[PDB]
Amino acid sequence: EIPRESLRLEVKLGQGCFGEVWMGTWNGTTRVAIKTLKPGTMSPEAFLQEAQVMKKLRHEKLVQLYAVVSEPIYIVTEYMSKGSLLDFLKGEMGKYLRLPQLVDMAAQIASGMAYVERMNYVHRDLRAANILVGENLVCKVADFGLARFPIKWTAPEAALYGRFTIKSDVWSFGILLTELTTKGRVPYPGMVNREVLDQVERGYRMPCPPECPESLHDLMCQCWRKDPEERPTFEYLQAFLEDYFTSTEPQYQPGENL
Numbered sequence: 001e002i003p004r005e006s007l008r009l010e011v012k013l014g015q016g017c018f019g020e021v022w023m024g025t026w027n028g029t030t031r032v033a034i035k036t037l038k039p040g041t042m043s044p045e046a047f048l049q050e051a052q053v054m055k056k057l058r059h060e061k062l063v064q065l066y067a068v069v070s071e072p073i074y075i076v077t078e079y080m081s082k083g084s085l086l087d088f089l090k091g092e093m094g095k096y097l098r099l100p101q102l103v104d105m106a107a108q109i110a111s112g113m114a115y116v117e118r119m120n121y122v123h124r125d126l127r128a129a130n131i132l133v134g135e136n137l138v139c140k141v142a143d144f145g146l147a148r149f150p151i152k153w154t155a156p157e158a159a160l161y162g163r164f165t166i167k168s169d170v171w172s173f174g175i176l177l178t179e180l181t182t183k184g185r186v187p188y189p190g191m192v193n194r195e196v197l198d199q200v201e202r203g204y205r206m207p208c209p210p211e212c213p214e215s216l217h218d219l220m221c222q223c224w225r226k227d228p229e230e231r232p233t234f235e236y237l238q239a240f241l242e243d244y245f246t247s248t249e250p251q252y253q254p255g256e257n258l
């Protein structure tokens with residue numbers, strides 16, 4: 001799956017903490033997004049044993065990996081039009097995104113994470129910046145396999161005792177639910193990365209966002225339960241969001257924000 005580094009990048013989509021991501025072409029006609037990884041902790045060997053990212057991790061709502069170079073890498077994947085969900089919520093599209101759209105995008109994310117769950121895999125960092133948005137509201141999970149930081153998204157079990165499991169990503173899915181229902185705003189508004197750990201251990205949970213039904217805030221608190229194994233399945237989360245406007249909020253009327 002290793003092609004050589006003679007397919008070159010055109011447009012730089014953005015810069016992040018660990019490497020760059022570019023927009024380019026592959027074999028002359030395929031439009032392709034290429035994530036570069038600078039000399040951070042490039043596991044030129046333990047990175048190529050990452051043959052599972054690409055094997056049977058092919059799902060509708062997972063970003064389809066195409067190829068990898070074996071120096072600095074260029075993870076070759078599909079090109080998602082609207083970029084990251086975080087920008088799509090902050091941007092101009094936020095003005096017209098309502099709850100039915102936000103809950104559909106949450107259902108898609110749960111679907112792809114339900115696939116990662118069925119495959120007994122773990123995605124150690126799930127948030128709105130690691131989810132890509134195409135057109136017609138297609139969300140896909142990206143950035144799943146990086147082991148080698150967002151404390152406001154990580155479950156308390158995994159920040160203090162390194163216990164990352166699929167239930168740990170349920171926790172951040174709940175935090176991600178707040179990003180959808182606040183149009184990209186930063187969780188625990190007003191607090192800092194260590195002020196958050198004191199409050200979560202003491203029992204503090206984020207209140208109900210404005211205009212958001214408590215039906216959906218209760219689903220966050222199920223994802224924010226102290227005991228990991230009592231947090232809901234991604235199978236349950238997917239079905240819950242898929243049926244939401246029929247089994248849970250049939251009296252929902254579209255407001256001015258949600």
Ligand SMILES: C=CC(=O)N1CCC[C@@H](n2nc(-c3ccc(Oc4ccccc4)cc3)c3c(N)ncnc32)C1
Nearest residue numbers: 013014021033035075077078080083084087142143144
């Ligand atoms: C400036 C705001 C905005 O939108 N951003 C911010 C700047 C970067 C932009 N970015 N990155 C990717 C991408 C492409 C391939 C990839 O390999 C995987 C790594 C781990 C797991 C799965 C794949 C990782 C990320 C990417 C992409 N497809 N499509 C659009 N934008 C992307 C999004």
